[PDB]
Write a protein that binds this ligand. Structure first.
Ligand SMILES: Cc1ncc(COP(=O)(O)O)c(CN[C@@H](CCC(=O)O)C(=O)O)c1O
Ligand SMILES: Cc1ncc(COP(=O)(O)O)c(CN[C@@H](CCC(=O)O)C(=O)O)c1O
Ligand SMILES: Cc1ncc(COP(=O)(O)O)c(CN[C@@H](CCC(=O)O)C(=O)O)c1O
Ligand SMILES: Cc1ncc(COP(=O)(O)O)c(CN[C@@H](CCC(=O)O)C(=O)O)c1O
Lengths: 452, 452, 452, 452
């Protein structure tokens, strides 16, 4: 199996795309932009409906970090289909979910007292995390960061501030969320070159929260929780300065406010550590996780400081959570991660770092490259000084990449996210990076961007 | 397999129950009322970790309608595991999510243009129904029923109204929900015997909404929707009057207000019909479903009039939506309902109708029996005139039923829900009712309730 | 002065009514129901711009309790105009605001520690009661009564529940208000004759709050207050059962919930007692007042248990609060109430009780008469059994009353409020009732209502 | 009458301050900081209870712009006491309120179609302005600026973001308000010297709204209204760059969003023009006004684009609004303003400008002076580079000023506002400025601030 795409969209793929519009809601699908109709997968390759074969650099939106069809994960589901699928894990008990909870507690950030709530997705996780914070603190408000994307349900909508379309005629969602600039070292309201000047940018963010919220309109003692992603994912895959969460805890702790680390995307080994937050050297009180945890099965988890746990029964619960198939799959994923995959993403870090700083130098359309492990984001600006978003160009590059057999996804207004399965070999990476470049190169020539 | 219980909880179950309290959040588990620790299942029975075997009348909180381990479903899954698990349905198209989506619209109540938004759970369904209701109507408010349960996320909790604990310390949740008395024929504020006088109670519930909301504090034309359960799942299995939803649509259409019907529990032919609402001869604008459709797999589904689809991309989306594994399970589950299982639930309806009216005639502790198909709800009262809840007694029956090999669920303050798998045989249905009557009989004697 | 009307509206009034529609916002003026253009006043009568003279039974919407132009009040003002008008009471202290504040606590219902927050109006009073309730209890929610009116600011409108138009296009207003049926003896959802069966109706209204809010969707211990009018001013002058507020305090104390009584209309001895609540033998934690206390001057006053005072400075404040001109008028107004005017309203109560029961016996259009002191409310019904509002007819009576020299106010959908100044003589009280009966009689004949 | 204070607080003033604490709510009073107990006034002098005489530089918190006891204003109230005090100006009509409305429309900013709503205070005005905006646009959200102070009621609380104490345990207030930095040329999150670099600062504010709200979490088409004060008053009396509202309209108009100019403090001639906004060369759609409009009587007005008016009756109204005494007083104030006072504040502008830039040069404790007409704010910083607030020093200066006979008020965290009556002579000003300096001088020596 090598990349091989004779034509796309194919007659079969064209018929699915017609049908999908007949019977399915307008979500985030894009007929022209993302005409990829998957029928099966193998290793790091999607096999489409018309037979075209594409190297994967999307990993099912980060859902698959172990691979697109992990053997150990399908054996674990098969083995768990034999005993029990569902055991109402919130009314009755079952050991599988307890085995997962104990494992999740174990691998949590830091070395502190933890408990675990189970969910079916990242939005449910972050909904959980909200209630848990509301209950334990008896405070009702929350800080999130502009660019953050925590979900699409009425709690997480409030928290999510990536695209105003997300909240189109949704107002009002859950009250008490206030937003401040994320320390985005490429776009922040201060013009600050956050790579050259990280402490200057860290300070401006903190100084905003302290001086322009707490001192004016936000009672600091009324804030349950600060919600952050350790790398904004949907927000264009943004890496904030190394010493940012350390400075943020300092300010959190000074007003007895919870830190909530949304690792729905950047967790499960993606950045060459179990959790994204470790690189930033802080122990979050609540850690939410989903996507990659279920290795292709729907699963969500909320990991928290044990003393934050719900006083009484019937505050929160869910029928679906605690499903055995998902828990069987999860334990297996975490085993795959600990036994090779997490080391592999640290191994391929310097390869994506060199090859993308190569592309930075050469293609003037690229404004910024950034990432950790196998979590990368290239943002494409029309003009480097102006930093205007090349949204149209980004779409063209993805389409071009798809034509050449590379599967990519667009995060943010003007960037593309490289997130292959953590199983990818050195020879499968160089292939993706080679294809990716050739996509930029074509679209660069097409529009008269310099090529140094 | 037969029912076969020695010590429950046995020594392995006691160890699991301990481990659960240590690692896992405080939810709706009860070591003292629901001490059932499930290792595996076959046919209609649970096998616990000590090897005790119990007849199922809980059906995993109405999720295993097709059986606790259906052969058709597990084969449909394992076939799909050979192809692909997750395929980024929100961003990329696959045929499986389309087939399921297409299938769902076809089986939907009435005969009108429908589309479908795939979700991960009941709450993730009703959350979606909210946003569809909001976006389509460009109205922000909803009506809901006291006694209703629609999920535990910041949207749905405004909608939910079963127990205050559910909303404890959560305010504010989503604004704009106003609630009103569900036409419970047994408990309503007007005292009305709703079984005897079903029109009088319908008028009252309607009179309230028109005269007390619409004429005083709730602008009719600013209401985006009315969420109702056709039978309240966590409300004690309250069955409304047959002409209720008819009267409620007369009112709804008069002000352009969408009627949303929640079938997360009573759906998938639980009541002897594919959709619970069908018994009531009305067509809802939205239908939400989860639980049973997945058939042991987490699944979500919001079915709506094509008119209400979001005009633009990026209003609502989800990473796990349209799971191919889940879609494969769902289609298999649907076939079984149409090819035997729905018929079997019409067939066994009279048995329960008989045996549970035999039980009310005999045991004074039983205030009201009610149900359709294989959805039954016995409510237990201290006195038949004052109707004080027999909460302590209801919990004892559940514990007694369990020491005699019957998995039962509480539902409401003082009632028990009988919801066996729709694959249950006549002989297995009698066996479980026998054991159910015995558990009432024990707890009746113990407390000196009358036995006629 | 006598009543004396020729053309109303006369040619100067028509010119003013035109100028008003041109320069001024669309509020609660009605050229077609309230075409009364006031130039000056003396004693108990209005003189209009054409020199038509009308007997007053409106009392400036219950503001001129002491008369339309009281000598004592105007002297108290002009004496204060010689000293100072505004003195920055919020920031600087003056003796006048303290004297009035001290005076207000002394006259307050019951005998407990009280303080006072001076405001500018009824809404600015109840807004204050909210913040005092919130700050003191550290609870965010309130209960209120369907039919209630408490003002038209973003706090109070949640509290208010008289007409939807009041809340049209305003959502969201302040969250956390839940409403319930006021124990109207004439119109309630249970049908109960509350005059006949006042306990049955009290139980119902109480049963609703306990069983339908506190037991299902409203955590009792998260309710900061219950706002009630002792008689609903814009609700058609509905007089609740005498033992109602007693039962409601039993419940309120059981959950630590402040009972707030609004006397913005029924206060200042309107009902023959200084405070309207007094008739009901309970002591409210907060008492709000405005209108009549000012005596032709804008004034606001929130009276509360000393326990609930804000711990810190800068939570609540207002620039115009504690106006010295207004305080001088208020003290003068209070003296009159205690030195003649409250007595005069007890004295004239039987007259209205007679004449309006004589009118109900005679005119079939009259569904219900009700009132205390000099607060009377006739409600007009199409039919006495169906109780459909006689809205069109009620408006005609007001117009007929006015062509015969009687200023009257609508109140509720189909009723009229009789609220003359408390300086009204027995002879002036008979005259206005005679004219009132005549206006009913005309509109009865015109529409073929029965005359017994 | 000259400044003359032998001792303060006096034995009489000490007794009032004791009593005030017995019977009055904790608001913004400060026993130690503002021990000024007014008994009467004359010209520009307060006469305290113990006989001490103080030149006024507070003007009753900006309430008196015509003087502390204007003759023309007391003659107008006296003349209006004779005819009518209250005439329920929202139910019935009266020419006085129409005469005021017509006058207010006339003197409004720009030359456009206007209507007028009447209120009792600035909070009611801004509550009005909210509803009017909500109704006309059918949008529910609003932008205000950090530092803004629009009121203390549940709508205006949301809008007000000056001190977090203001919102202490108040959450939730009205949803949908979002806040952005005010272009404060001395403190903004960008460090921008707004006097040297106004366009750079204007852009950063606009660029924040456009790029960090509209493009991320705030749908621009869902924003009814941008609320601004043309000089932040309570926020330390801050003058934003001359071309700021012009750039803000540009952005407003591009998304069909209303501009709401809160002139409650800076209006009624205070800045040497009728309205503060004129200096900034834009025509606001809604203009709110109170305080100075009533010349010592409680009055509020909301002036708006006529096509924004309430479609239907009963959306908004108030019992108090339209009071004749206040309207009589208002017309008189506006006459005083147009016939000398507004020219006088333009005359004394260069005198406060020179004498305060004198004080800037000499006293290192002064960080910034700023203002227009007779609206001035001196902010005192501990260190000029650091800009730390000298809150304690500010209190000392006010107390010191009070001791020497000068009446001042503290606006913001570390500044004092000079706002004498517009009637003040050149010789009464130099006196105030002389006293003010001597207060700074003393406190400067006391603490070892340089004196150049
Ligand atoms: C922080 C965060 N929260 C929630 C989710 C997904 O919530 P679910 O509960 O699984 O529905 C994601 C996935 N990030 C995706 C989200 C795409 C979308 O929701 O449209 C991304 O890569 O943008 C996420 O990164
Ligand atoms: C109407 C409705 N909505 C939502 C849900 C659950 O949403 P999920 O997304 O599947 O979690 C249920 C299940 N009713 C269960 C609820 C159990 C609980 O949450 O405590 C019941 O029958 O008690 C339901 O009946
Ligand atoms: C309980 C209550 N609160 C507040 C108010 C009015 O607050 P203000 O601040 O004095 O405006 C009223 C007056 N009831 C009037 C209301 C008129 C109206 O606003 O339309 C009435 O009798 O209709 C009232 O009864
Ligand atoms: C913008 C604005 N809104 C409202 C008000 C006052 O609202 P009322 O309706 O009159 O109560 C003021 C007065 N500015 C004063 C406010 C002081 C205070 O409210 O504590 C000031 O100078 O700080 C104001 O400047």
């Amino acid at each position: 199996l090598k990349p091989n795409v004779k034509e796309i969209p194919g007659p079969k793929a064209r018929k699915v795309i017609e049908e999908h519009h007949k019977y399915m809601a307008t979500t985030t699908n894009d007929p022209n932009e993302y005409f990829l109709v998957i029928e099966r997968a193998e290793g790091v390759y999607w096999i489409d409906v018309d037979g075209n074969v594409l190297l994967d650099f999307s990993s099912g939106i980060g859902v698959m970090n172990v691979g697109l069809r992990n053997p150990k994960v399908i054996e674990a589901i098969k083995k768990q289909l034999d005993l029990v699928l569902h055991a109402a894990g919130t009314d009755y008990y079952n050991p599988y979910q307890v085995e997962l909870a104990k494992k999740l507690v174990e691998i949590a950030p830091g070395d502190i007292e933890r408990k675990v709530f189970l969910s079916n997705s990242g939005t449910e996780a972050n909904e959980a995390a909200l209630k848990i914070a509301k209950w334990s603190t008896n405070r009702k408000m929350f800080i999130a960061f502009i660019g953050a994307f925590h979900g699409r349900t009425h709690g997480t909508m409030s928290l999510t501030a990536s695209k105003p379309v997300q909240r189109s005629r949704m107002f009002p969602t859950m009250p008490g969320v206030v937003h401040v600039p994320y320390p985005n070292p490429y776009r922040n309201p201060w013009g600050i070159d956050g790579y050259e000047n990280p402490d200057e940018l860290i300070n401006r963010v903190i100084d905003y929260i302290e001086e322009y919220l707490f001192e004016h309109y936000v009672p600091a003692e009324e804030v349950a929780g600060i919600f952050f992603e350790p790398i904004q994912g949907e927000g264009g895959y943004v890496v904030p300065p190394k010493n940012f969460f350390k400075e943020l805890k300092k300010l959190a702790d000074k007003h007895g406010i919870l830190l909530i680390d949304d690792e729905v995307q950047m967790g499960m080994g993606r950045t060459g550590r179990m959790w994204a937050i470790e690189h930033f050297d802080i122990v979050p009180d609540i850690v939410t996780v989903a996507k990659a945890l279920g290795g292709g099965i729907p699963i969500g988890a909320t990991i928290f400081r044990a003393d934050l746990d719900f006083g009484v029964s019937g505050v929160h619960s869910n029928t679906f959570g605690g499903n055995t198939v998902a828990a069987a799959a999860a334990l297996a994923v975490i085993e795959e991660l600990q036994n090779g995959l997490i080391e592999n993403a640290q191994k391929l870090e310097p390869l994506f770092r060199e090859r993308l700083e190569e592309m930075k130098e050469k293609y003037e359309i690229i404004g910024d490259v950034r990432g950790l492990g196998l979590a990368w984001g290239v943002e494409f600006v029309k003009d480097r000084k102006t930093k205007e978003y090349a949204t149209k160009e980004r779409g063209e590059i993805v389409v071009e990449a798809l034509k050449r057999g590379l599967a990519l996804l667009g995060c943010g207004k003007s960037a593309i996210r490289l997130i292959p399965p953590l199983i990818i070999s050195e020879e499968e990476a160089k292939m993706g990076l080679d294809i990716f470049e050739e996509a930029i190169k074509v679209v660069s020539e097409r529009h008269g961007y310099k090529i140094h």
